[PDB]
Amino acid sequence: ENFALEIMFDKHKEYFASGILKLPAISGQKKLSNSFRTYITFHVIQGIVEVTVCKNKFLSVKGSTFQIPAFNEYAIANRGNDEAKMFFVQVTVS
Amino acid sequence: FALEIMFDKHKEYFASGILKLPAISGQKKLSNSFRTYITFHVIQGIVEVTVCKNKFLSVKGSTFQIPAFNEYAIANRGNDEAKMFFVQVTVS
Amino acid sequence: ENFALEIMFDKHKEYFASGILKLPAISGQKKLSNSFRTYITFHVIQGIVEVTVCKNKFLSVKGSTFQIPAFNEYAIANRGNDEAKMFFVQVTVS
Amino acid sequence: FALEIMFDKHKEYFASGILKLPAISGQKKLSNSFRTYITFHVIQGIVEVTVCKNKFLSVKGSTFQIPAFNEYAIANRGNDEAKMFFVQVTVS
Amino acid sequence: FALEIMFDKHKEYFASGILKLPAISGQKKLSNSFRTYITFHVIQGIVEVTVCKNKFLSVKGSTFQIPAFNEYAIANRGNDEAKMFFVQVTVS
Amino acid sequence: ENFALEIMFDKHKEYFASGILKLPAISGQKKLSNSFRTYITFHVIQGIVEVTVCKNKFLSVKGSTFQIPAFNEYAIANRGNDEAKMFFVQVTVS
């Protein structure tokens, strides 16, 4: 279950691209992916998610914040009732 | 205000944090970003932003950026304290 | 009264883009603009200009030097008799 | 292991060096790149690499990269000592 | 020579300055840029530049660049002192 | 006798471009070139070469390592019997 998303970015006006990632609350809707040539910071605005990066699972809850380095495969699963929402910022590496 | 910045530079690319504005009026911040680009995301509250010429209200779940070498102000314009998550890069 | 200008840049030979900005001496010929995704340094080689950046006016004369950060609206007015000339260097931000 | 890094920052863009693994098993290295991108080129030996999930054998005259903020391991899996030339950039 | 570099790093992206060559022959400079890219603009005088292999005369209102990790020389080849405005970035 | 070469680079997977430069053992096969907007590091895996950069000749043998800064003309001559092989890494400047 792959995904890009869902970017707000006016490269002439502002430095960072950013947006919101939404995960429907079915453990059907866990999301495998890859950062490619960009660094991402996520911030959990709603939900409980389980993150998998390199060789690590961790649980992230509302208010907690995680980062994906460039060229990394990573996954995110929803672990709660509500849909999960993450604000993110990203930069393509230089 | 209350700023706290998290940055373990040997593990992460970005620095991030929470800016809390215990809010009335009060409750408020003046600044200058320096060699720093910042993105703020509003997680609770309604806030008023001044960068450069501009002034806008910015509301829960919205987002704004401050470019390097700009002076900016953030003022709480609501009854509950305002909280923002922010990400930053100190440029070069 | 908007303007780009007027760039010398062989991206395979050299690091910086650069050039010369010329303002005709009519206060008709003041010039609103925006740096977008680039940093500019100006150097007044002839004239007296008034610069407006972010929220600041300043006067610049022959020999004086100013900078525009990226993503900034800025304006330049000629305030003297002669046409005004500025050498500049610029870099698009990373 | 034996690492030696050459970097005269005022003359060169990159840092480089030789990583020697006096090899049996032994003979081996655990790590984390940090704010550093690394490329390794195998000049003598056969080595086993672990970055992230992956594990591969990497043989004389082959080449592999480690991205910043990844933990990696290199183990000698051959009878002669292994030597790698590497180039790195400490990012920003 | 007389160099003076202006750089308030918390307010500006670039460093800049004036290089004065009180000129006869004299009057002259040898160097190496290091981790620095430089642009020079000639505001008064005629000067002779050596970067790498090259040698050229460079005249009032003209412009030349020096790449990082190159040795360069600037010599005054005129009767009045030479002055250059320059901009630089110390790379990474 | 000009040359590019011969690059392995999946820009979405990895940070550096890299490869191997091979010089046939005829002093016919010396190779003038230019780094343009990139920094290169070379590593002599086989041979004896003579490098010319900016204003410098130097001899490089097996195991020795040299660098070309961006925007530089440079040449490489084979000085030995065998064909000469150099591993290299490169980055286009920012």
PDB file of all heavy atoms in Angstrom, chain A residues 33-48:
ATOM      1  N   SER A  33       6.060   3.422   2.027  1.00  0.00           N
ATOM      2  CA  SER A  33       6.558   4.542   1.203  1.00  0.00           C
ATOM      3  C   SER A  33       8.076   4.721   1.232  1.00  0.00           C
ATOM      4  O   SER A  33       8.810   3.905   1.795  1.00  0.00           O
ATOM      5  CB  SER A  33       5.875   5.857   1.619  1.00  0.00           C
ATOM      6  OG  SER A  33       6.256   6.931   0.778  1.00  0.00           O
ATOM      7  N   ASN A  34       8.532   5.801   0.610  1.00  0.00           N
ATOM      8  CA  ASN A  34       9.961   6.115   0.527  1.00  0.00           C
ATOM      9  C   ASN A  34      10.227   7.627   0.346  1.00  0.00           C
ATOM     10  O   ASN A  34       9.548   8.280  -0.450  1.00  0.00           O
ATOM     11  CB  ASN A  34      10.619   5.305  -0.592  1.00  0.00           C
ATOM     12  CG  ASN A  34      12.113   5.470  -0.616  1.00  0.00           C
ATOM     13  OD1 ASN A  34      12.627   6.590  -0.594  1.00  0.00           O
ATOM     14  ND2 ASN A  34      12.828   4.357  -0.642  1.00  0.00           N
ATOM     15  N   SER A  35      11.194   8.178   1.091  1.00  0.00           N
ATOM     16  CA  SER A  35      11.397   9.631   1.124  1.00  0.00           C
ATOM     17  C   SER A  35      12.153  10.124  -0.102  1.00  0.00           C
ATOM     18  O   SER A  35      12.135  11.308  -0.444  1.00  0.00           O
ATOM     19  CB  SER A  35      12.128  10.066   2.402  1.00  0.00           C
ATOM     20  OG  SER A  35      13.432   9.510   2.480  1.00  0.00           O
ATOM     21  N   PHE A  36      12.846   9.208  -0.761  1.00  0.00           N
ATOM     22  CA  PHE A  36      13.656   9.571  -1.908  1.00  0.00           C
ATOM     23  C   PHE A  36      14.580  10.704  -1.516  1.00  0.00           C
ATOM     24  O   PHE A  36      15.248  10.641  -0.492  1.00  0.00           O
ATOM     25  CB  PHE A  36      12.770   9.939  -3.111  1.00  0.00           C
ATOM     26  CG  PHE A  36      11.899   8.798  -3.587  1.00  0.00           C
ATOM     27  CD1 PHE A  36      10.503   8.852  -3.445  1.00  0.00           C
ATOM     28  CD2 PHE A  36      12.473   7.642  -4.138  1.00  0.00           C
ATOM     29  CE1 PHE A  36       9.692   7.775  -3.876  1.00  0.00           C
ATOM     30  CE2 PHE A  36      11.682   6.567  -4.555  1.00  0.00           C
ATOM     31  CZ  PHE A  36      10.291   6.634  -4.431  1.00  0.00           C
ATOM     32  N   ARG A  37      14.614  11.748  -2.319  1.00  0.00           N
ATOM     33  CA  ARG A  37      15.658  12.739  -2.170  1.00  0.00           C
ATOM     34  C   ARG A  37      15.168  13.909  -1.336  1.00  0.00           C
ATOM     35  O   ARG A  37      15.350  15.050  -1.722  1.00  0.00           O
ATOM     36  CB  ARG A  37      16.118  13.217  -3.544  1.00  0.00           C
ATOM     37  CG  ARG A  37      17.582  13.351  -3.643  1.00  0.00           C
ATOM     38  CD  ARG A  37      18.008  14.304  -4.714  1.00  0.00           C
ATOM     39  NE  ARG A  37      19.418  14.668  -4.560  1.00  0.00           N
ATOM     40  CZ  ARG A  37      20.452  13.837  -4.706  1.00  0.00           C
ATOM     41  NH1 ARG A  37      20.293  12.557  -5.007  1.00  0.00           N
ATOM     42  NH2 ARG A  37      21.664  14.298  -4.535  1.00  0.00           N
ATOM     43  N   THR A  38      14.510  13.638  -0.218  1.00  0.00           N
ATOM     44  CA  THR A  38      13.892  14.703   0.569  1.00  0.00           C
ATOM     45  C   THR A  38      13.940  14.305   2.040  1.00  0.00           C
ATOM     46  O   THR A  38      13.962  13.117   2.347  1.00  0.00           O
ATOM     47  CB  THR A  38      12.395  14.886   0.226  1.00  0.00           C
ATOM     48  OG1 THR A  38      11.681  13.717   0.615  1.00  0.00           O
ATOM     49  CG2 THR A  38      12.152  15.120  -1.251  1.00  0.00           C
ATOM     50  N   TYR A  39      13.968  15.292   2.939  1.00  0.00           N
ATOM     51  CA  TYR A  39      13.840  15.042   4.364  1.00  0.00           C
ATOM     52  C   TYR A  39      12.470  15.528   4.763  1.00  0.00           C
ATOM     53  O   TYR A  39      12.040  16.598   4.332  1.00  0.00           O
ATOM     54  CB  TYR A  39      14.867  15.821   5.160  1.00  0.00           C
ATOM     55  CG  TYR A  39      16.288  15.609   4.752  1.00  0.00           C
ATOM     56  CD1 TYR A  39      16.899  16.493   3.877  1.00  0.00           C
ATOM     57  CD2 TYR A  39      17.048  14.554   5.267  1.00  0.00           C
ATOM     58  CE1 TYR A  39      18.205  16.331   3.494  1.00  0.00           C
ATOM     59  CE2 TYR A  39      18.369  14.367   4.869  1.00  0.00           C
ATOM     60  CZ  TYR A  39      18.933  15.276   3.980  1.00  0.00           C
ATOM     61  OH  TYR A  39      20.243  15.185   3.567  1.00  0.00           O
ATOM     62  N   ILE A  40      11.801  14.748   5.600  1.00  0.00           N
ATOM     63  CA  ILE A  40      10.439  15.031   6.025  1.00  0.00           C
ATOM     64  C   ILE A  40      10.408  15.103   7.547  1.00  0.00           C
ATOM     65  O   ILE A  40      11.084  14.314   8.226  1.00  0.00           O
ATOM     66  CB  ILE A  40       9.492  13.913   5.586  1.00  0.00           C
ATOM     67  CG1 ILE A  40       9.600  13.695   4.081  1.00  0.00           C
ATOM     68  CG2 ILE A  40       8.060  14.277   5.925  1.00  0.00           C
ATOM     69  CD1 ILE A  40       9.062  12.346   3.586  1.00  0.00           C
ATOM     70  N   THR A  41       9.657  16.059   8.079  1.00  0.00           N
ATOM     71  CA  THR A  41       9.325  16.021   9.494  1.00  0.00           C
ATOM     72  C   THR A  41       7.823  15.875   9.577  1.00  0.00           C
ATOM     73  O   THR A  41       7.102  16.581   8.875  1.00  0.00           O
ATOM     74  CB  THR A  41       9.760  17.304  10.245  1.00  0.00           C
ATOM     75  OG1 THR A  41      11.186  17.469  10.135  1.00  0.00           O
ATOM     76  CG2 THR A  41       9.352  17.244  11.720  1.00  0.00           C
ATOM     77  N   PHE A  42       7.361  14.937  10.402  1.00  0.00           N
ATOM     78  CA  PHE A  42       5.942  14.767  10.662  1.00  0.00           C
ATOM     79  C   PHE A  42       5.567  15.207  12.067  1.00  0.00           C
ATOM     80  O   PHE A  42       6.365  15.095  13.003  1.00  0.00           O
ATOM     81  CB  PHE A  42       5.556  13.316  10.528  1.00  0.00           C
ATOM     82  CG  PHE A  42       5.564  12.816   9.134  1.00  0.00           C
ATOM     83  CD1 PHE A  42       6.690  12.161   8.631  1.00  0.00           C
ATOM     84  CD2 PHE A  42       4.437  12.935   8.333  1.00  0.00           C
ATOM     85  CE1 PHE A  42       6.706  11.650   7.324  1.00  0.00           C
ATOM     86  CE2 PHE A  42       4.435  12.429   7.026  1.00  0.00           C
ATOM     87  CZ  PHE A  42       5.578  11.787   6.511  1.00  0.00           C
ATOM     88  N   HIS A  43       4.336  15.678  12.214  1.00  0.00           N
ATOM     89  CA  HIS A  43       3.837  16.078  13.502  1.00  0.00           C
ATOM     90  C   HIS A  43       2.418  15.556  13.662  1.00  0.00           C
ATOM     91  O   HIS A  43       1.526  15.943  12.911  1.00  0.00           O
ATOM     92  CB  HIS A  43       3.880  17.601  13.655  1.00  0.00           C
ATOM     93  CG  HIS A  43       3.456  18.073  15.009  1.00  0.00           C
ATOM     94  ND1 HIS A  43       4.256  17.943  16.124  1.00  0.00           N
ATOM     95  CD2 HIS A  43       2.287  18.593  15.446  1.00  0.00           C
ATOM     96  CE1 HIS A  43       3.612  18.397  17.184  1.00  0.00           C
ATOM     97  NE2 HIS A  43       2.414  18.797  16.800  1.00  0.00           N
ATOM     98  N   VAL A  44       2.207  14.678  14.637  1.00  0.00           N
ATOM     99  CA  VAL A  44       0.895  14.059  14.807  1.00  0.00           C
ATOM    100  C   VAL A  44      -0.156  15.033  15.370  1.00  0.00           C
ATOM    101  O   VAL A  44      -0.127  15.390  16.557  1.00  0.00           O
ATOM    102  CB  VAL A  44       0.961  12.803  15.680  1.00  0.00           C
ATOM    103  CG1 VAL A  44      -0.442  12.257  15.882  1.00  0.00           C
ATOM    104  CG2 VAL A  44       1.811  11.767  15.010  1.00  0.00           C
ATOM    105  N   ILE A  45      -1.077  15.476  14.520  1.00  0.00           N
ATOM    106  CA  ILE A  45      -2.110  16.381  15.009  1.00  0.00           C
ATOM    107  C   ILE A  45      -3.354  15.649  15.497  1.00  0.00           C
ATOM    108  O   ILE A  45      -4.090  16.170  16.334  1.00  0.00           O
ATOM    109  CB  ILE A  45      -2.469  17.526  14.023  1.00  0.00           C
ATOM    110  CG1 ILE A  45      -3.028  16.992  12.714  1.00  0.00           C
ATOM    111  CG2 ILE A  45      -1.264  18.467  13.789  1.00  0.00           C
ATOM    112  CD1 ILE A  45      -3.532  18.100  11.788  1.00  0.00           C
ATOM    113  N   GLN A  46      -3.557  14.424  15.010  1.00  0.00           N
ATOM    114  CA  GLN A  46      -4.639  13.566  15.489  1.00  0.00           C
ATOM    115  C   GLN A  46      -4.281  12.099  15.292  1.00  0.00           C
ATOM    116  O   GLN A  46      -3.742  11.724  14.253  1.00  0.00           O
ATOM    117  CB  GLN A  46      -5.927  13.885  14.737  1.00  0.00           C
ATOM    118  CG  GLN A  46      -7.001  12.818  14.843  1.00  0.00           C
ATOM    119  CD  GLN A  46      -8.320  13.263  14.215  1.00  0.00           C
ATOM    120  OE1 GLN A  46      -8.797  14.374  14.475  1.00  0.00           O
ATOM    121  NE2 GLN A  46      -8.909  12.403  13.375  1.00  0.00           N
ATOM    122  N   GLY A  47      -4.583  11.274  16.291  1.00  0.00           N
ATOM    123  CA  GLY A  47      -4.446   9.831  16.152  1.00  0.00           C
ATOM    124  C   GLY A  47      -3.323   9.203  16.947  1.00  0.00           C
ATOM    125  O   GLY A  47      -2.656   9.863  17.762  1.00  0.00           O
ATOM    126  N   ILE A  48      -3.169   7.901  16.742  1.00  0.00           N
ATOM    127  CA  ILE A  48      -2.073   7.129  17.268  1.00  0.00           C
ATOM    128  C   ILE A  48      -1.613   6.354  16.051  1.00  0.00           C
ATOM    129  O   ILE A  48      -2.407   5.656  15.418  1.00  0.00           O
ATOM    130  CB  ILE A  48      -2.559   6.153  18.356  1.00  0.00           C
ATOM    131  CG1 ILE A  48      -3.061   6.923  19.574  1.00  0.00           C
ATOM    132  CG2 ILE A  48      -1.447   5.211  18.821  1.00  0.00           C
ATOM    133  CD1 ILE A  48      -4.041   6.137  20.469  1.00  0.00           C
TER     134      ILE A  48
END
